[PDB]
Amino acid sequence: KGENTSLLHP
Amino acid sequence: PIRLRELIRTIRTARTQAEEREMIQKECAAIRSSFREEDNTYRCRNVAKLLYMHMLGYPAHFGQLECLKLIASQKFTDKRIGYLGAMLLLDERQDVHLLMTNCIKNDLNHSTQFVQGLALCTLGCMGSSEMCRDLAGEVEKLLKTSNSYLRKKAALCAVHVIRKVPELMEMFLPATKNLLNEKNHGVLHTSVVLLTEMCERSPDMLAHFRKLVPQLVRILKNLIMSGYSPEHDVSGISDPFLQVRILRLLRILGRNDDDSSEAMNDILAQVATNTETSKNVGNAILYETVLTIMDIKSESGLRVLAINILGRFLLNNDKNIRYVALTSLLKTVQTDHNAVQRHRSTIVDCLKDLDVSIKRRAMELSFALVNGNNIRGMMKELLYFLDSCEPEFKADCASGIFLAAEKYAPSKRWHIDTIMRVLTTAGSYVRDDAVPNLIQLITNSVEMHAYTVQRLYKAILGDYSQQPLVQVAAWCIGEYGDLLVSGQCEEEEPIQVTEDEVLDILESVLISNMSTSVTRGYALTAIMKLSTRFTCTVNRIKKVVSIYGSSIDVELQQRAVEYNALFKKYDHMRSALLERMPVME
Amino acid sequence: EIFELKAELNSDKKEKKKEAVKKVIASMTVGKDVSALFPDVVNCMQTDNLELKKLVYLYLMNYAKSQPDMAIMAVNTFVKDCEDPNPLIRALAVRTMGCIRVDKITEYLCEPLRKCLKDEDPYVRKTAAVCVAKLHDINAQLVEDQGFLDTLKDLISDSNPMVVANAVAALSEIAESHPSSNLLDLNPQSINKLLTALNECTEWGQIFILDCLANYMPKDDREAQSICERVTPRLSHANSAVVLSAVKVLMKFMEMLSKDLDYYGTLLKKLAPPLVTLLSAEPELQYVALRNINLIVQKRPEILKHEMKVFFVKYNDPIYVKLEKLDIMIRLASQANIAQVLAELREYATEVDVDFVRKAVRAIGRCAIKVEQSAERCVSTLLDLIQTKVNYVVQEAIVVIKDIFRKYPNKYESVIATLCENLDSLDEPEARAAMIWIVGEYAERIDNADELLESFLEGFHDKSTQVQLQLLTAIVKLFLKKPTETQELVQQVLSLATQDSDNPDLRDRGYIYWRLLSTDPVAAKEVVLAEKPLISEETDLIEPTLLDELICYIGTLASVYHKPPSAFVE
Amino acid sequence: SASAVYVLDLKGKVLICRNYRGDVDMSEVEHFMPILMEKEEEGMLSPILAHGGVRFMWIKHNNLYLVATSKKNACVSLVFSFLYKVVQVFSEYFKELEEESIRDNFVIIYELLDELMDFGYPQTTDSKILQEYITQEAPRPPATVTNAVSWRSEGIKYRKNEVFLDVIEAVNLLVSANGNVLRSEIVGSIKMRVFLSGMPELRLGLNDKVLFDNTGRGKSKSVELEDVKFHQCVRLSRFENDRTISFIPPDGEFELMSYRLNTHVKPLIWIESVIEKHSHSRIEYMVKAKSQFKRRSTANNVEIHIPVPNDADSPKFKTTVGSVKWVPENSEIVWSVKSFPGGKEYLMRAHFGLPSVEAEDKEGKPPISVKFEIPYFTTSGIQVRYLKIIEKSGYQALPWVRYITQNGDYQLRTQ
Amino acid sequence: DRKGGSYSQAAGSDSAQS
Amino acid sequence: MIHFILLFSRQGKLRLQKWYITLPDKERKKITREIVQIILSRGHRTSSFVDWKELKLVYKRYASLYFCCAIENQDNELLTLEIVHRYVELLDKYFGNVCELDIIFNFEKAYFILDEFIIGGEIQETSKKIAVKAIEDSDMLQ
């Protein structure tokens, strides 16, 4: 997928 | 009324481009059917779907009147949807935003702080040359208000109006006076941006805006001292946008005055050493300060500190840092040119870097750093870079080399040799526009013609597919046929030029399929001029001209007909108009 | 994963071995570099089940060049499998041996190839014929040393028509790469024998059988007549390539046939229905059919003279087919169907393809130039298109009018008034220059020629080199014809192109014009405004040497591209 | 002379590849997708690509484009024929042409690809014959492939001997906007589903004009078929000699012959349509359809596609007979009629809205297409005379055939 | 029955042509 | 001032677009396609800076979806990156674990946040909490 990941992961 | 999420899921469920287009058309049919009925309840969903379809690559021309109708509505969601539609699908060339002026004026006096702000943002985003003319009076009214949330919007609207209408800046001078004491960071940033825009638009306000330099310096010092703040403090830098705006204003202010430069010298010195460049914000602030110092008449110590900072940043492994350093060096080329020669090794190494932007910056810096003493040494490096350059950079490298040779060429013979080498190696990379410049340079020089003619003859017999090189060789032949072959009226000893190879080459170029009608014209002109310039091969080009007078090209056919007429009826007057053209700069 | 797969493949259970083989095949097909496990799968090679053997052979073929050293452990397995009683196993082994791109492995495979050359099984014979050609392509010297040419020659003279066709194809491929030395050509008896097996050949074998006759050159009309009579039945084949191959063979044989006899007329009559049938093929084959028709059109244009309705471009026709339809119509354009061609071009001008519109305009101009009987109709169509108020259409019409005026300008004075005001604001260099040239050459029926040129002189120094030259030529022509209304205009043009003009060719032209004006203005009428000779139009017909060479190269890449076979191969 | 036949996907992923000569590296497929994108975006897209010295000639299937690499001057027509044969084989083996079967039937797909073509030269292409040697659920190859008869498998036994024929007609009319028909051709289609015992040698006999003239009966209704394309089982020599249609029918449905002759008769359906499109105000569709076909024949499922405006909305249909529906996906008015008696006349009055704002670019004028399909109607008048079913054992066959008339390229040019 | 025209039996040869 | 801002995915699909220059729709589409091709045809060590048509095109994608900007040659380059990072952080704080799925469905919220943050290519609020509070207040209005 790779879309559910956060933009910055904070 | 289908929901936005449902439409998004339906679009995502389509895989084929044709299937996606069919689904988009099916949705747009329902949207148009709803719009034609004057629907007002589910208008927001239809507007969102239309905006999504337009952003997805589908036409939205029919959804123009609906946005205008929803803009003048009373619902907050409907007003927001109309504003979004006007901002997205509305532009200056749309021609449907003229009616939006009345809606903006009606919403400009709305008591709600969101409707007025949304209208101001839409006006700033889609400012037109006529909307700003009829909206200048309302914009200035909001600029004098004390609304912090509205002060920034008013400043942005004024900046947009000034950018769209440079003649309307006179109405903003009495409105922005005494506005540098705003406590809010956003208001101060907007005021600084507006002042910078006013200064850059016209220089009449520079004197009026130059009195506030001490206030700006004090504000910058206070911001630097207040390095801790929950708001605007990111990565240890407080108000990075405000600091950048202040640095830009300081650089743009006092660039040609000593009082303005001297007033901000202490602040620049304090910020040049009291700033942490570990993060990207610190590096950007340092780059802005260095650019401001280079663009202003600062002290020698500030220049030395800027040079040291640029040298330190040039060695950074970060691609962004290297690009920023290269841009700063290119900007500070004319100013402090002597100190820029210390990074010649770094500039040369940057050409071999694997960064397209970095390579371009290094090439630009090398081109701008070419002087009257390093031109000979840098010529070999430029030739090596052009030989091993990218396909899209070979033409740029050749153009830069030609410009450097024409500007600071050490000698005509060396410059001529470099130009010939570039033409022979550039091939299909030399721009056709440089051909007239090369022709003018050749015509201006009247001391080196035999060697240049021989070199052109040698380089033209090998290949002829180079349109610029072919045109240059044809022009050189047409200008110096009397020097290319000396004493070749009749049969003589075997030499490089025999008075017949040039004619055969010209005929082959004219009849060659690798002709764009420009090199063929040059070859025809050279052949026509060789009738008087050369007398050994006489009565031979006339047959070719007569045969070439029926060419398919209208201009080529007319030129051939004129040449044949001149050769058959004006043989005595043929030499009466074959004089050399004047040479000018 | 990799360790688990290796452990599964190194097991004694066939149920896990099959799953491991399937997983390895999927990983390679899924895009996984499974070449590191090639030696591990080498141990699990000699298996009774044919399902795993095929996968192993495919993996070895796909993992042969990557690890040639690890492939040295398969010669014994191939030798053992080359004698299996099942013909399918032997054929698979032969195919795998020829597919192995190993230089040190083909040397030891000569004996199995020799053993399988005389195989009684027709599938085995075909597999051996393919393997011999593969070995020759991989190693010509090894194939020549093995003496497989003699076996291949006798293969065509044996039973099994499919095997004979395969052997013929292999021999043609070998001779194709051969330097023509020791050609495998055969006498009329061999041709008759091949024709006897031609009717028993399959769809794929039919092409191989007909390609053999493409190289043979008949020497007598009786032989050519017999060849034409035998190839006549091939025109009713469902395969498009078979029909195309038969058409190419007939065209090649027509070079030796006599037009005096009725055979040439019958062949010409029987070829049009084949072209019509091929014209209704798939859209992918439409381009190939159009290219073949264009190649044969320049050779024998009397066959498809009446074939014009089938050349109409369809609404759903592909862009590559729509473009070729215009070229086919132009090649077949004639005064008999001039009205139909004009109607088709008029309909094609209402489409939305800008490239299609330009192609249609070019085709209309070419048709107008080729046939002078429809010049008035073409001019009227161009005027209507210009009145259509289309920018691309306007530029195309301007270009067509400029081309036509230089060709047939004797009766072109009736359109100058209409073109005098035709929205001259268009900035297309190909249209503005054409309009300037038309005005300069036709500056007699327009009383405001000087006024029109005034607007084009505002940016003459920065418009373009060709545009500037055309404007200068028009100004010079106007001054020579009417110097009373253009006396100051000529001086202004000379000043702008001689003082402010830095173009070398343009500067030379301006200096020459100034010198001619200052030397003898009267002589400029007979020197500049002279009657140019007839313009030689660029003939679209290819050279006869290329057409003769292209005739044999039918259905290949050199025919679609209209380029020589040695000018496109690498 | 293809170097490697590969099967790609819609995202550029190669579903399956099978090199046949190896003269082209497998990494060249990566540039095929960008090359196709550049050709399509610049209008230079063609079925035959060219990656330097290697050409990528392939066609686009239902879900993937079968790109076959080649390096030498290979026969592009041969490559196209091989691709068509492979597509037919895949359709016969797999009922669907999509990526769902490519990733699920690789075991049989690889075997079929290996067996079909060797060294770039295909050898076996009969799906029915190929199904006896490669199965997805191996014995010696059948003798049919080695034998001359590769389209009639021996040993086939059936309880009955019934052959079903299908004389499918395709009425293609190219009517210009001026009202004149330019391309009016009818192509016959004789598709037969032979299901008998053994390998009978069919002796086809019809009422051909040439056959009637040769026999001397050139006075009755004879079909003047300009082009006749016989199948592989049909012997070309027999037809060339005395128009003898002698061939061995296969087991299943296949196309024996395909007639194709020009048509000079009146159209079966005459459509008189008007366009009262106001300038950004409204539009009128005065469409009248006149059936010129025989009254005894009925056109089942008549679908006259009328292209309506692309941006038209709020449409109203005032017709006489048949369901009228506007499809936003197709952007046209579908004049759907279930049963259309011969000589019927349907009148329609369309009325749809249009936005006040003009469109940015023109959309063109799609032609009006009719989807009439009248069964039991032979427009060409060709009638089957006899079918000589001969078997060595000797049996009484019960052949059957049906005539179906439909509209082919029957499009009407718009004004 | 069947859409597109009911299937009809076919003859064996031209009995009138011998 | 930022000439344009475009949020494009790694596959090439654009999830956001905001251009401050009045350009034709066909011209805008061509420019977007060229920008996608240039960014999609760039490595990971290109410095995240491109001079396309004399425009400081800065690319800095924190996930599969990339980000683009059009900055004129009159301001610093790190300022654009800092502004982009601040905007991403503000969007994450307003949304809460912002991912690709929420961007497509909540495109209107992202557009509203961008409008409330940057107007006309210039910044409107330097702080990160005041803008969030204003956006929340505007959303709560109904």
UniProtKB/Swiss-Prot annotation, chain B:
Membrane-topology annotation of the record: Peripheral membrane protein
Domain of life: Eukaryota
Compartments (UniProt record): Golgi apparatus; Cytoplasmic vesicle, Clathrin-coated vesicle membrane; Cytoplasm; Cytoplasm, Perinuclear region
Any one GO biological process: vesicle-mediated transport
Function: Subunit of clathrin-associated adaptor protein complex 1 that plays a role in protein sorting in the late-Golgi/trans-Golgi network (TGN) and/or endosomes. The AP complexes mediate both the recruitment of clathrin to membranes and the recognition of sorting signals within the cytosolic tails of transmembrane cargo molecules.
Assigned protein family: Belongs to the adaptor complexes large subunit family.
Protein name per its UniProtKB record: AP-1 complex subunit gamma-1
Organism from which the protein derives: Mus musculus
Lineage of producing organism: Eukaryota, Metazoa, Chordata, Craniata, Vertebrata
Interval of the full protein contained in this chain: 4 to 588 of 822
Curated annotation (Swiss-Prot), chain D:
Residue(s) carrying Phosphothreonine: T144, T146, T215
GO annotation, cellular component aspect: AP-1 adaptor complex; cytosol; early endosome; lysosomal membrane; synapse; trans-Golgi network; trans-Golgi network membrane
Gene3D superfamilies given in the database record: 3.30.450.60, Mu homology domain, subdomain B (2.60.40.1170)
Subcellular localization: Golgi apparatus; Cytoplasmic vesicle, Clathrin-coated vesicle membrane
Record note on modification: Phosphorylation of membrane-bound AP1M1/AP1M2 increases its affinity for sorting signals.
Keyword Glycoprotein tagged: no
Protein topology in the membrane: Peripheral membrane protein
Recorded coiled-coil stretches: none
Chain segments annotated as transmembrane: none
Residues recorded as bearing N-acetylserine in the entry: S1
Main location as per UniProt: Golgi
GO aspect biological process, one term: endosome to melanosome transport
CDD domains the UniProt entry points to: AP-1_Mu1A_Cterm, AP1_Mu_N
Keywords of the record: Acetylation, Cytoplasmic vesicle, Golgi apparatus, Membrane, Phosphoprotein, Protein transport, Transport
Domain (MHD) ranges: 160-413
Pfam family, one: Adap_comp_sub
Domain of life: Eukaryota
Function summary: Subunit of clathrin-associated adaptor protein complex 1 that plays a role in protein sorting in the trans-Golgi network (TGN) and endosomes. The AP complexes mediate the recruitment of clathrin to membranes and the recognition of sorting signals within the cytosolic tails of transmembrane cargo molecules.
Assembly description: Adaptor protein complex 1 (AP-1) is a heterotetramer composed of two large adaptins (gamma-type subunit AP1G1 and beta-type subunit AP1B1), a medium adaptin (mu-type subunit AP1M1 or AP1M2) and a small adaptin (sigma-type subunit AP1S1 or AP1S2 or AP1S3). Interacts with MARCHF11.
Family per record: Belongs to the adaptor complexes medium subunit family.
Curated annotation (Swiss-Prot), chain E:
Disease listed for this protein: Alleles A*02:01 and A*24:02 are associated with increased susceptibility to diabetes mellitus, insulin-dependent (IDDM). In a glucose-dependent way, allele A*02:01 may aberrantly present the signal peptide of preproinsulin (ALWGPDPAAA) on the surface of pancreatic beta cells to autoreactive CD8-positive T cells, potentially driving T-cell mediated cytotoxicity in pancreatic islets. Allele A*24:02 may present the signal peptide of preproinsulin (LWMRLLPLL) and contribute to acute pancreatic beta-cell destruction and early onset of IDDM.
Induction: Up-regulated by IFNG, and pro-inflammatory cytokines IL1B and TNF.
PTM field: (Microbial infection) Polyubiquitinated in a post ER compartment by interaction with human herpesvirus 8 MIR1 protein. This targets the protein for rapid degradation via the ubiquitin system.
Protein name: HLA class I histocompatibility antigen, A alpha chain
Localization terms from the record: Cell membrane; Endoplasmic reticulum membrane
Segments of this protein annotated with the region Disordered: 2-18
Domain of life: Eukaryota
Notes concerning its domains: The alpha-1 domain is a structural part of the peptide-binding cleft.
Swiss-Prot record, chain F:
Gene Ontology MF, one: clathrin adaptor activity
One Gene Ontology cellular component: AP-1 adaptor complex
Keywords, sorted A to Z: Coated pit, Cytoplasmic vesicle, Disease variant, Golgi apparatus, Membrane, Protein transport, Transport
Transport listed as a keyword: yes
Protein name: AP-1 complex subunit sigma-3
Record text on subunit structure and interactions: Adaptor protein complex 1 (AP-1) is a heterotetramer composed of two large adaptins (gamma-type subunit AP1G1 and beta-type subunit AP1B1), a medium adaptin (mu-type subunit AP1M1 or AP1M2) and a small adaptin (sigma-type subunit AP1S1 or AP1S2 or AP1S3).
Tissue and organ distribution: Widely expressed.
Cell compartments where the protein resides: Golgi apparatus; Cytoplasmic vesicle membrane; Membrane, Clathrin-coated pit
Functional description taken from the UniProt entry: Subunit of clathrin-associated adaptor protein complex 1 that plays a role in protein sorting in the late-Golgi/trans-Golgi network (TGN) and/or endosomes. The AP complexes mediate both the recruitment of clathrin to membranes and the recognition of sorting signals within the cytosolic tails of transmembrane cargo molecules. Involved in TLR3 trafficking.
Family as reported in the entry's similarity comment: Belongs to the adaptor complexes small subunit family.
Membrane topology reported for the UniProt record: Peripheral membrane protein
Keyword Membrane belongs to the record: yes
Gene Ontology biological process terms, A to Z: intracellular protein transport; melanosome assembly; platelet dense granule organization; protein targeting; vesicle-mediated transport
Domain of life (superkingdom): Eukaryota
Main localization category: Golgi
Gene3D superfamilies: 3.30.450.60
Pfam families: Clat_adaptor_s
